[PDB]
Amino acid sequence: PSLSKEAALVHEALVARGLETPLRPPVHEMDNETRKSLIAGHMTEIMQLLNLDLADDSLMETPHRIAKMYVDEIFSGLDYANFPKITLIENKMKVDEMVTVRDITLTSTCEHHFVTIDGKATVAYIPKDSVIGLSKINRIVQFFAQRPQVQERLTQQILIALQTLLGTNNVAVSIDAVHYSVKARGIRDATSATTTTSLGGLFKSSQNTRHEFLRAVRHHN
Amino acid sequence: PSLSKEAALVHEALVARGLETPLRPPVHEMDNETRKSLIAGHMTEIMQLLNLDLADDSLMETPHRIAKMYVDEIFSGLDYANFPKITLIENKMKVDEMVTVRDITLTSTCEHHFVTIDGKATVAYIPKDSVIGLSKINRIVQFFAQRPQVQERLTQQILIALQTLLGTNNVAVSIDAVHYSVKARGIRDATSATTTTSLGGLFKSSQNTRHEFLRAVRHHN
Amino acid sequence: PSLSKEAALVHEALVARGLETPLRPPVHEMDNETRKSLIAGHMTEIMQLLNLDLADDSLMETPHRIAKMYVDEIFSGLDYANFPKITLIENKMKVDEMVTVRDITLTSTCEHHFVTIDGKATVAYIPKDSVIGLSKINRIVQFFAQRPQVQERLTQQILIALQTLLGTNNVAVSIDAVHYSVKARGIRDATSATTTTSLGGLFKSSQNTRHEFLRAVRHHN
Amino acid sequence: PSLSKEAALVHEALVARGLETPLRPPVHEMDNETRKSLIAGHMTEIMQLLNLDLADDSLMETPHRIAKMYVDEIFSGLDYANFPKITLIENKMKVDEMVTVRDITLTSTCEHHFVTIDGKATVAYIPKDSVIGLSKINRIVQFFAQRPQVQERLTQQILIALQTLLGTNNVAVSIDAVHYSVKARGIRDATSATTTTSLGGLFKSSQNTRHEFLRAVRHHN
Amino acid sequence: PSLSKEAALVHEALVARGLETPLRPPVHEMDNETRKSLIAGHMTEIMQLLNLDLADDSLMETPHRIAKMYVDEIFSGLDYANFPKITLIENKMKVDEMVTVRDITLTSTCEHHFVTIDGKATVAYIPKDSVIGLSKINRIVQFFAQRPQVQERLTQQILIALQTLLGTNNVAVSIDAVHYSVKARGIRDATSATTTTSLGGLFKSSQNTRHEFLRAVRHHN
Amino acid sequence: PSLSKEAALVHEALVARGLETPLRPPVHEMDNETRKSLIAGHMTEIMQLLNLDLADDSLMETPHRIAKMYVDEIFSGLDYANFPKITLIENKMKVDEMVTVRDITLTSTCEHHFVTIDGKATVAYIPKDSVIGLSKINRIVQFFAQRPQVQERLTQQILIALQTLLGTNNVAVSIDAVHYSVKARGIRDATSATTTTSLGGLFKSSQNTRHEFLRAVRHHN
Amino acid sequence: PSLSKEAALVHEALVARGLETPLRPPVHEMDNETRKSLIAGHMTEIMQLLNLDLADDSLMETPHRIAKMYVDEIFSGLDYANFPKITLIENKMKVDEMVTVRDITLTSTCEHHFVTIDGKATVAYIPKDSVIGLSKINRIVQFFAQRPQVQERLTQQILIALQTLLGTNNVAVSIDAVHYSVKARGIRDATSATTTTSLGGLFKSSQNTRHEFLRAVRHHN
Amino acid sequence: PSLSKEAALVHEALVARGLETPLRPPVHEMDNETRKSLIAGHMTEIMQLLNLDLADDSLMETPHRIAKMYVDEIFSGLDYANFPKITLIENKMKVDEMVTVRDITLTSTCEHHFVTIDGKATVAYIPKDSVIGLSKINRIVQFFAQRPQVQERLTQQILIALQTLLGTNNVAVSIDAVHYSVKARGIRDATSATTTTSLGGLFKSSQNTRHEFLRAVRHHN
Ligand SMILES: Nc1nc2c(ncn2[C@@H]2O[C@H](COP(=O)(O)OP(=O)(O)OP(=O)(O)O)[C@@H](O)[C@H]2O)c(=O)[nH]1
Ligand SMILES: Nc1nc2c(ncn2[C@@H]2O[C@H](COP(=O)(O)OP(=O)(O)OP(=O)(O)O)[C@@H](O)[C@H]2O)c(=O)[nH]1
Ligand SMILES: Nc1nc2c(ncn2[C@@H]2O[C@H](COP(=O)(O)OP(=O)(O)OP(=O)(O)O)[C@@H](O)[C@H]2O)c(=O)[nH]1
Ligand SMILES: Nc1nc2c(ncn2[C@@H]2O[C@H](COP(=O)(O)OP(=O)(O)OP(=O)(O)O)[C@@H](O)[C@H]2O)c(=O)[nH]1
Ligand SMILES: Nc1nc2c(ncn2[C@@H]2O[C@H](COP(=O)(O)OP(=O)(O)OP(=O)(O)O)[C@@H](O)[C@H]2O)c(=O)[nH]1
Ligand SMILES: Nc1nc2c(ncn2[C@@H]2O[C@H](COP(=O)(O)OP(=O)(O)OP(=O)(O)O)[C@@H](O)[C@H]2O)c(=O)[nH]1
Ligand SMILES: Nc1nc2c(ncn2[C@@H]2O[C@H](COP(=O)(O)OP(=O)(O)OP(=O)(O)O)[C@@H](O)[C@H]2O)c(=O)[nH]1
Ligand SMILES: Nc1nc2c(ncn2[C@@H]2O[C@H](COP(=O)(O)OP(=O)(O)OP(=O)(O)O)[C@@H](O)[C@H]2O)c(=O)[nH]1
Helix, strand or coil, X not given: CCCCHHHHHHHHHHHHHCCCCCECCCCCCCCHHHHHHHHHHHHHHHCHHHCCCXXXXXXCCHHHHHHHHHXXXXXXXXXXXXXXXXXXXXXXXXXXXXXXXXXXXXXXXXXXXXXXXXXXXXXXXXXXXXXXXXHHHHHHHHHHHCCEECHHHHHHHHHHHHHHHHCCCCEEXXXXXXXXXXXXXXXXXXXXEEXXXXXXXXXXXXXXXXXXXXXXXXXXX | CCCCHHHHHHHHHHHHCCCCCCECCCCCCCCHHHHHHHHXXXXXXXXXXXXXXXXXXXXXXXXXXXXXXHHHHCCHHHCHHHCCCCCEEECCCCCCCCEEEEEEEEEEEECCCCEEEEEEXXXXXXXXXXXXXXXXXXXXXXXXXXXXXXXXXXXXXXXXXXXXXXXXXXXXXXXXXXXXXXXXXXXXXXXXXXXEEEECCHHHHCXXXXXXXXHCCCCCC | CCCCXXXXXXXXXXXHHCCCCCECCXXXXXXXXXXXXXXXXXXXXXXXXXXXXXCCCCHHHHHHHHHHHHHHHHCHHHCHHHCCCCCEEECCCCCCCCEEEEEEEXXXXXXXXXXXXXXXXXXXXXXXXXXXXHHHHHHHHXXXXXXXXXXXXXXXXXXXXXXXHHCCCCEEEEEEEEEHHHHCCCCCCCCCEEEEEEECCHHHHCHHHXXXXXXXXXXXX | CCCCXXXXXXXXXXXXXXXXXXXXXXXXXXXXXXXXXXXXXXXXXHHHCCCECCCCCCCCCHHHHHHHHHHHHHCHHHCHHHCCCCCEEECCCCCCCCEEEEEEEEEEEECCCCEEEEEEEEEEECCCCEEECHXXXXXXXXXXXXXXXXXXXXXXXXXXXXXXXXXXXXXEEEEEEEEHXXXXXXXXXXXXXXXXXEECCHHHHCHHHHHHHHHCCCCCC | CCCXXXXXXXXXXXXXXXXXXXXCCCCCCCCHHHHHHHHHHHHHHHHXXXXXXXXXXXXXXXXXXXXXXXXXXXXXXXCHHHCCCCCEEECCCCCCCCEEEEEEEEEEEECCCCEEEEXXXXXXXXXXXXXXXXXXXXXXXXXXXXXEECHHHHHHHHHHHHHHHHXXXXXXXXXXXXXXXXXXXXXXXXXXXXXXXXXXXXXXXXXXXXXXXXXXXXXXX | CCCCHHHHHHHHHHHHHCCCCCCCCCCCCCCHHHHHHHHHHHHHHHHHHCCECCCCCCCCCHHHHHHHHHHHCCCHHHCHHHCCCCCEEECCCCCCCCXXXXXXXXXXXXXXXXXXXXXXXXEEECCCCEEECHHHHHHHHHHHHCCEECHHHHHHHHHHHHHHHHCCCCEEXXXXXXXXXXXXXXXXXXXXXXXXXXXXXXXXXXXXXHHHHHHCCCCCC | CCCCHHHHHHHHHHHHHCCCCCCCCCCCCCCHHHHHHHHHHHHHHHHHCCCCCCCCCCCCCHHHHHHHHHHHHCCHHHCCCCCCCCCEEECXXXXXXXXXXXXXEEEEEECCCCEEEEEEEEEEECCCCEEECHHHHHHHHHHHHCCEECHHHHHHHHHHHHHHHHCCCCEXXXXXXXXXXXXXXXXXXXXXXXXXXXXXXXXXXXXXXHHHHHHCCCCCC | CCXXXXXXXXXXXXXXXXXXXXXXXXXXXXXXXXXXXXXHHHHHHHHHHCCCCCCCHHHHHHHHHHHHHHHHCCCHHHCHHHCCCCCEEECCCCCCCCEEEEEEEEEEEECCCCCEEEEEEEEEECCCCEEECHHHHHHHHHHHHXXXXXXXXXXXXXXXXXXXXXXXXCEEEEEEEEEHHHHCCCCCCCCCEEEEEEECCHHHHCHHHHHXXXXXXXXXX
């Protein structure tokens, strides 16, 4: 058991363009449980360098929690052994109109601070030879989001990965989000938010198809 | 008594486009009541296979309910013996402008999980030689909605049917919906929603007409 | 005392187009208070057929009311003797831009079921040599509304009516409305609504004008 | 086949208090199809009395429609032969706290003008020995709603009927609604709305229980 | 490995009150993959019994999907092997005031129809010796929500379980939920929603405390 | 320069009640700029255990930002050298009613995951001999907000701090917050929120006062 | 002391286009206080003509009140001695983009019934050689508002005045408003409203500029 | 230590277009503390001119406060010493689509009265060779804002300054603000607001890009 056929295509396709998350070759496959006990230590250290009484029955566990949260959760998207199982059906209905999925839950982390990123993504595409199972578009967004990110790049990734799996370039990804490393820290701006978009295929070349999308983006409930 | 003049025209027209819902020739007409007893038999088993104390007064009747639900309710739209009665009125006012019926209630089920689909549909058209009774639009939407469905197809069928019955191509359908097989299970995205559309006639070729429609789409109360 | 100049013009213009509500020549003018008596009698017969105890002090006067409501109220628009008193004012300010009246209260009845029609209307036009008194637009919408109606036609009449009076073809009418014979009966669609429009003059030929209008249409408070 | 056991109890329990809708002993059972043909003739008359060219392909069917709508739909609750099938389950959970079913859809007709009544009902009860199937409180409300009504009484019947089937006085009912006979005609008050309630059992004696309810009433979405 | 300490206590606590979901002694431990393949079989039947072309590449998988869904998902709460890991921390701050967790996401299924139940819960308690890790309340709620349910009971269990684990009877649970077997099928009430509550400890005996709770329940965003 | 008079009292006050955040005797005052460098290197380690390319001109600096954040930012509230400069003004207007500050911006971190906490807090007190300057309330909240926290404890600290500085027991603190370690990870509850309250003096003893406060709590814009 | 340079130009500019409010040459300068005493008299008369007990301590002063209101208040824009002191600043910043002041409070009187007109005005212009003080657009609007008006015209005067004072024609003005002599009297239309617009310069010739404006017109809060 | 490279480029770039705030050569660098004592002196003087009892322990400090505020806060943007530390990253992801930062908290003061200005700014740019870190756009906006301003100029400075640091003319800036010197003083308009914008690069020449921006402007929550 290695990877998946789609995960390969997708990963490679992102490296070609250099839109892959800056990683170093894994080299040797250091036990996964081993990386948690190690990471925990470094935390068990940072907490002491801050004078946090690790004798406390609550703070005590913290280090193992943060470790687990890193290896197994908020960053699981860095291992392609986690790429969502993609499923498509043949386009017999012949849908030549865009299918949209709006207000997709996106939970991420800026790579600059390792601080929360709360945002919504709106994906859209024009089926060609096949139609993707709706939920997939969800799982894919969340996949790339579970990584130390940069908004402008996270968007590009979602765009390319979908084109790849879809077999078209007629895909559009738009992400609207808030950076707590901007809201609860430093400039502490309570009301701003950043919106990034990546247009492919007709979405970028056709003035008409372009705006037909942008207009239907950014909705509440 | 066999069927109706509209039900056939619409049905045959949909098979021509291979847009009908994947069915097998009925073959013989086994007693409608007989099916509910059989389908009832199986579920009785599945519930046993789940360790569900079928002695209990409440669960006891469940099997019969599901069967009834499948045969006589949520899938009723599979039998054109239930196609809504269509009634038209000559277009003497010569209405050359599009009529729009928005926020139409649409209840359905995904054929992949046999799970609830909740959304609203929007239909518009341009009367040619006849205007359809407003409640017919509603009724046709709810007819095809009452089947094991796929949102991309469901939108297509409604289009074609109304085109057939109305005798024009100038018809536009636009469904918005939430798949619980995508919200309460699996990826569990609690905020996402899928928007599909089917544009015909001028609603597809006329840049102007097209947008006029789309712009008036997606409304709350 | 016959009718009114405008009334006549408007009436004839609508008969010219055949956009008059389907009526039969009055013939003789059978006492108005005499029809109320015959109609009240028929309602009495119907109520009895419904096993309603007409002996009851409350149900007792229902017939008289329903008869009254029919002849002297909800259908009062069927007699041009009720046409609003129009009044204009020379266009000395030289208004060459459209004037708009949005969210006009429109009460009407569906001629198919004699049930309530609840909707709002938006009227706009471009002054030529005269400017109508604002409340006039209102009175006229409610005049035509007070008849057994068909939305598509109710809209055509108002358009033409104002065209006649204003003396321009630059008038647009749009009606958003809810049909209770849809909502509370039959399909019972609690959320749906129908929007029908009628564009004239520049509003129909000028893409620019046409959209400037439609955009300002459909508002709340 | 006569009626149902519960349909009886309720009817009886309703006549006892004199809260039944003013009805006359049916006498002979006049064929149902016979009434609709007799009532239709009556509308055919009233329409000719309004100078409605019944020759028109549209206005032509109106009579049979109204007739069918009277006998088969909007008043079908005047026949206990339509009473919903009540079903209950043993209160093994011993739920000694109230169960509320809010914003229940209620469609009705005022007996004074045979005009539309648009409202929402909120029902609550404290289970005693049995817990009613949720969709039953909905069915009973709509049952009595489908009759020529007076809001004040409409509330009363629901309350009683429920108390009866439940075997408890602990039931509270409250309806919130708009009479179009007051909004689209006559005083034409577009904003008013009427609220009427009927507190039973502890909902009327317990100062605490009472308010707990009232406060939990009148909600939007 | 059998179960967990807490899992047993809560399970017994419920059976002792007769609040455990009506089940049957599992008997033998038949292979888990074995049930899906069986369940999958029957479903394959029912689908055939409905004339659904199992030949189609999409519906082809459905039987295996529903099987998976039943055993491995939506009903996953029936196997106490999945009870969330509970973790508390000595009440050293002596929090003598109630802690409230609102708008908790709740997904369930009605044992009566095996249909979706969309709802939100509001849990609150008053710390005695221990404070529960916030997310545990959320976990316990979705734990019992993943079973063939009945709102009135679901609310009960959640209370009892919490009381058990927390070591106090001062715990209130309130669920507001929409049953789709009542909104997209049957009476089809597009707006009603049921609200059930279960008060314990002071939340039931103390008038003040009881109301402090109920007043802050039912919130949007 | 050691500290401030206020800072001491408050700190002593909290220690006395055991409501101080779990810490360890500082011992020696190792260079603040030396701790940053060690913490930074430890992050450098974790990032290399995740397979991140620290070579990237962007990820390159993260280790320093985080080190800066943890020492000179998100936890600054651990050092009372940073305690806000409180300033009072004799109560000559004899204000004997409560002063309430609502929707105070509160930015915090959970000591269980070292993750974001987004919330607002409302604080009210009854001026005795002095009236605190409105912004100090804000400052004081944020002071205790910047620390590895537990909401329950965060609430108490703020309360006692204020009591102490105000020379009264009549203050009330309420924090309504959202934990991302609950929203964007784990159970992932997109909608839940936690409300905690701390009542002192009258706000706890007088049912009259108590509710006056609680009701005026939880506001939007 | 006679008038003001600007006031003069603006006045003449308006007289030139014939957009001045229908007035008569003052002739002689009758004392201002003298007019109040005369007007008051007439009101005293009319009120007696309404059988109002002018003996009552309250109704007694109404006469002097209406007079004072007519002379020194609601119609004060009828005297250019009140025109606002305009003030401009050289456009060194070279702003070649439009400046928009939206939602400006506009209070006027319909000359037809001497009844309240409630609305909001939106003004936009493209700076040429000078930039007007913001507050001025406000003042100027209110200046022409305090007069017996006609919406279509009150809009014209604003445009022209503004163009004149600004030394440009790139000016746009839009007023959205309610006329109580239409809401609470006559047709009594509780929900309708009027919108009037006057486009100048590029706002009238440039398709682009036009829409950019219209689109940012009509906002709430 | 003098200033910063960027601070320089920007400052000059502005001096070239004359968009710098009207300032006089510093000449000498009088001690900063020295200024606060003199400025405080004048205020101590002005308050005595207004018969304000400076004896009062509260009004006492005020002079120093207003001194401090002028020199160290609301005007700190007048000394490039406070210019934010910009930090970019190479555009390897080649983002050829605009990046939008909406609803930036902007706090300023009109130079005409030295009174509050509360608003929000929206910025967009198309990455050329570099990508600005997000929080930067925020601090740049807040830099220039902290000055005796003029909304039409404040906008320009933000445009120019950004362009210069970005290396592109493809930078757009909008400022929706409320001038209190207009709301709570003079004309006192409690509802109006001013909107200004500055378009550069494609945002100005390309009709497409231009609207794509404008449309996405003016948002709430
Ligand atoms: N395009 C489309 N996809 C649908 C529709 N209904 C369900 N689906 C998709 O069908 C897929 C189910 O694919 P499977 O391969 O069986 O996997 P699964 O275990 O059901 O996967 P998840 O549902 O994502 O947990 C998903 O992608 C659903 O989102 C529908 O109307 N249209
Ligand atoms: N373009 C972009 N910038 C991001 C993203 N996430 C964090 N940033 C920005 O990266 C920058 C961090 O820059 P640094 O120079 O290390 O400075 P800092 O001390 O973190 O600065 P502040 O965040 O303003 O306090 C800031 O501009 C963050 O807001 C992201 O997804 N995209
Ligand atoms: N085009 C149009 N149709 C209308 C209007 N008002 C009511 N109708 C439709 O006219 C039809 C009545 O057709 P019938 O054939 O008598 O059938 P019915 O039993 O009355 O129809 P249902 O309402 O579906 O029960 C329905 O489709 C109504 O919804 C209206 O203003 N315009
Ligand atoms: N209490 C009550 N009154 C109702 C109800 N429905 C209609 N009504 C009232 O019954 C009255 C009809 O009384 P009538 O004496 O016939 O007078 P009318 O000309 O029909 O009355 P207006 O509606 O004022 O035009 C009105 O006051 C209606 O508003 C209802 O459910 N409850
Ligand atoms: N009472 C309280 N609990 C908190 C607070 N912040 C985090 N927690 C809870 O502390 C717990 C962490 O307990 P652990 O046993 O380490 O479990 P975990 O895997 O980290 O927790 P989850 O995965 O989130 O269920 C969870 O219940 C968190 O949600 C807080 O302010 N107050
Ligand atoms: N009290 C309660 N009733 C429920 C719940 N879920 C489903 N039900 C009700 O159980 C009943 C099903 O009763 P049956 O006698 O089988 O009738 P049915 O044809 O399924 O009923 P209808 O739903 O009215 O069509 C209905 O009242 C459902 O709405 C639940 O959580 N609580
Ligand atoms: N265009 C612009 N005008 C501003 C700005 N700030 C204040 N103003 C306007 O500048 C003007 C001050 O003009 P002055 O002639 O001194 O008169 P004033 O007594 O201050 O004016 P009023 O505010 O009408 O009382 C007013 O129109 C203010 O509203 C700003 O940023 N831009
Ligand atoms: N176009 C315009 N009409 C206005 C304006 N103000 C009042 N009016 C209209 O001027 C008319 C007065 O005309 P009249 O012939 O005296 O009739 P009336 O009895 O006052 O009119 P009703 O209000 O319909 O009763 C009405 O149509 C008012 O609504 C205004 O600013 N613009």
